[PDB]
Design a protein around this ligand. Structure first.
Ligand SMILES: [Mn+2]
Length: 274
């Protein structure tokens, strides 16, 4: 066991999934730090150094990392793999990114199994000496992720179908909402320039009052102020922060991809009174 195979990912969700597949034969590190906004992140010379010293670079694609392809052109002779191949996208519904793929596919546990398979194939291709370890680790982790779905589905099923309205800041929850039958209301369709402008807030407020939706949420890498503004003006309680674009730090409450799915579903369910 000389030097461990080095994997660099764009952001922390992929880092944790890939580190579960890598086990102890590879070290996986994220370019973005926990808590940092991932869509419009601006890479630094230090990021170039991290990617250039990698043996493999992983990214989401599906229009997530607006920075990645320009960044990756600086990187020489490091292979890359997009980890969303074979996932059927949901289009963004409005705004200047309307009609392109919603990137947040990892929020569907079923989609996470495809992430796992894509990361497995990439590690097996570019570090074939350890293919057996990658294959064994991916099969074990896919088992955990597959088993994850049923208790989450049952928990959210307790909410009456008619009242399944998921009101968030970014429209980052479309894939989770589809899996578990939530209608989707958000202050902005995808992180970009306009985030909490009028017209956005007033539409969401109208939807809330018409349907008496009991809770609204923010997310961990953006400002909670628009969501709190919405809850102040309506009957809706502020449900807290959901996790989608980033894990917490390893010593925080959301250190892993499994903990992120569990925490986000728990917080939603609690916002509805379980
Ligand atoms: Mn996002």
């Amino acid at each position: 066991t000389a030097k461990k195979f080095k994997v660099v990912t764009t952001f922390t969700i992929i880092q944790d999934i890939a580190q579960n597949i890598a086990g102890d034969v590879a070290v996986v590190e994220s370019i973005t730090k926990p808590g940092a906004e991932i869509h419009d992140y601006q890479p630094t010379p230090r990021d170039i150094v991290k990617a250039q010293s990698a043996d493999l670079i992983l990214w989401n694609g599906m229009n997530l990392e607006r920075w990645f392809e320009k960044f990756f052109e600086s990187i020489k002779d490091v292979p890359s793999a997009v980890v969303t191949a074979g996932i059927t996208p949901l289009p963004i519904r409005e705004g200047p990114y309307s009609g392109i793929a919603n990137p947040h596919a990892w929020m569907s546990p079923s989609n996470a199994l495809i992430y796992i398979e894509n990361i497995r194939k990439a590690l097996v291709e570019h570090d074939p000496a350890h293919a057996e370890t990658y294959n064994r680790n991916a099969q074990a982790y896919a088992e955990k992720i597959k088993a994850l779905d049923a208790p989450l589905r049952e928990r959210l099923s307790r909410i009456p179908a008619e009242q399944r309205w998921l009101v968030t800041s970014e429209g980052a929850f479309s894939y989770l909402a589809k899996d578990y039958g939530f209608k989707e209301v958000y202050l902005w369709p995808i992180n970009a320039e306009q985030q909490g402008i009028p017209q956005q807030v007033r539409h969401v407020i109208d939807i809330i009052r018409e349907n008496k939706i009991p809770v609204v949420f923010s997310e961990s890498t953006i400002s909670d102020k628009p969501a709190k503004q919405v809850s102040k003006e309506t009957g809706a309680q502020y449900g807290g922060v959901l996790y989608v674009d980033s894990l917490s730090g390893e010593k925080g409450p959301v250190p892993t991809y499994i903990s992120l799915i569990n925490m986000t579903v728990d917080t939603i369910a609690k916002g509805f009174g379980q």
